[PDB]
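Quick one, tokens below:
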């Protein structure tokens, strides 16, 4: 693998590309507000692809976009064929954002691509960046949702809510995003899979959990309704 590096925003070039990248960051950070026609719930890309200092998709084991462009096209079992990065973004619009894929030459989509390509500067095509994706967590027993409920109340509820509906900020963006219910990800999302949710939670939430705790609280989270895909 190669190291995960985050480029300096102060070395963004002047011109069309630089302006595109800045727009791309905003689309990824503020997606419901910026692309209402394509988003069907309360999630922005950054809610599962977080980053620091205003960037998006820069955190190891939270599916960083650093180095993503050199990994596409790639086979998708979902599609039964090779897909492009543009198509992969469409998938998370349709599933994680319970919405509609942008046209593959949509200027907002190209801006998102430009941003991901900026984050990926210097990464060799085909190389795997350390910390890519969301590592799954799988245990050799059923997740205990009763235990998970107790864990949720103690470790998650203060942010994500008794009803899993999250916490809005002053500008109407989710400070703490919804984990279930009508404004959360739909059943087609990867985050609706036990081992992916458990993996995400293990590596990223709160903010630490044992494997058993992550497994069990993920189970509890996924007992709830959410939009159907
Ligand atoms: C509900 C959580 C969630 C939201 C919201 C979300 N994603 Fe994802 N995304 C995932 C998960 C989970 C993966 C799979 C990571 C892996 O392969 O390990 C993923 C994978 C991706 C990948 C492929 C990453 C890779 O390394 O191959 C891209 C590109 C991507 N998402 C773009 C987006 C964009 C753009 C948005 C905003 C429109 C978005 N996602 C919103 C959960 C989310
Ligand atoms: C201090 C507040 C806080 C606590 C406590 C917290 N979270 Fe989160 N959670 C967030 C924020 C903010 C995000 C959006 C991603 C980010 O910025 O890291 C998030 C994202 C998530 C996501 C992906 C986004 C979504 O809407 O589905 C899941 C799943 C999640 N948290 C589950 C949990 C679980 C389970 C716990 C308890 C173990 C937990 N979180 C504790 C603030 C919190």
């Amino acid at each position: 693998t190669v190291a995960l590096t985050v480029p300096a925003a102060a070395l963004l070039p002047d011109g069309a590309l630089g302006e595109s990248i800045v727009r791309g960051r905003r689309y990824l950070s503020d997606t419901p507000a910026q692309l209402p026609d394509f988003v069907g719930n309360g999630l922005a890309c950054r809610h599962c692809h977080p980053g620091r200092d205003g960037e998006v998709g820069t955190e190891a084991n939270a599916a960083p976009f650093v180095g993503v462009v050199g990994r596409f096209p790639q086979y998708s079992a979902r599609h039964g064929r090779l897909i492009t990065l543009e198509q992969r973004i469409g998938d998370c619009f349709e599933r994680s954002l319970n919405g509609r894929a942008l046209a593959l030459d949509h200027p907002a989509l190209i801006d998102m691509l430009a941003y991901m390509s900026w984050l990926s500067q210097g990464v060799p095509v085909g190389a795997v960046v350390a910390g890519h994706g969301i590592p799954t967590l799988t245990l050799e027993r059923e997740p205990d949702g009763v235990h998970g409920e107790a864990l949720y109340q103690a470790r998650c509820l203060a942010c994500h809510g008794a009803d899993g509906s999250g916490t809005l900020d002053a500008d109407g963006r989710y400070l703490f995003p919804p984990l279930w219910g009508p404004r959360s990800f739909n059943t087609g999302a990867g985050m609706n899979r036990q081992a992916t949710a458990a993996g995400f939670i293990k590596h990223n939430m709160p903010l630490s959990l044992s494997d058993e705790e992550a497994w069990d609280v993920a189970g509890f989270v996924l007992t709830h309704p959410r939009p159907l895909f």
